[PDB]
Amino acid sequence: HTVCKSKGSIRNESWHIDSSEPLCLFKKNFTYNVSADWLYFHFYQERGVFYAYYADVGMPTTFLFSLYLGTILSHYYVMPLTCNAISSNTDNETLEY
Amino acid sequence: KYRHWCRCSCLPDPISTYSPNTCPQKKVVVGIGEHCPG
Ligand SMILES: *[C@@H]1O[C@H](CO)[C@@H](O[C@@H]2O[C@H](CO)[C@@H](O)[C@H](O)[C@H]2NC(C)=O)[C@H](O)[C@H]1NC(C)=O
Ligand SMILES: *[C@@H]1O[C@H](CO)[C@@H](O)[C@H](O)[C@H]1NC(C)=O
């Protein structure tokens, strides 16, 4: 699970525990438009290569990056975001995915 | 999930088994270039 920064909860963000740095194949940061209302992503795989698209403004998407894995991805999951900012008693805001 | 005699298996390995429908390991062929999954 994860926790949001503003108005945090009594829990702590803990989804992985690594004593040392594991082997990585891709580590890069990107910047997007913070004033955007909606975000769109195109994720797919082909010939063992992972492709990813993203868009901050407008409905059409643009190329972001590509990664080679050599395996076949099978499952995906969205972990819950638990904090005190998406509640009903507070301002009316909900999470959509 | 566990391996389910009543709770038997391929017996022997899938290389020389006679019940491929019940054996969990399915023989596959590489496609356009990948790695041997097992
Ligand atoms: C990508 O951004 C994240 C978050 O801004 C960076 O993670 C931070 O890393 C510094 C240095 O290790 C820490 O002091 C911060 O606490 C981290 N922030 C968070 C939220 O974890 C990350 O380093 C950036 N990656 C690159 C390659 O610059
Ligand atoms: C970000 O989005 C807002 C609202 O969608 C838009 O007005 C703005 O031009 C976009 N770009 C930047 C750099 O703020």
UniProtKB/Swiss-Prot annotation, chain A:
Disulfide bonds join C4-C83. Glycans are attached at N12, N29, N33, N92. Attaches the virion to the cell membrane by interacting with host receptor, initiating the infection. This is Spike protein S1. It comes from Human coronavirus HKU1 (isolate N5). The lineage of its organism: Viruses, Riboviria, Orthornavirae, Pisuviricota, Pisoniviricetes.
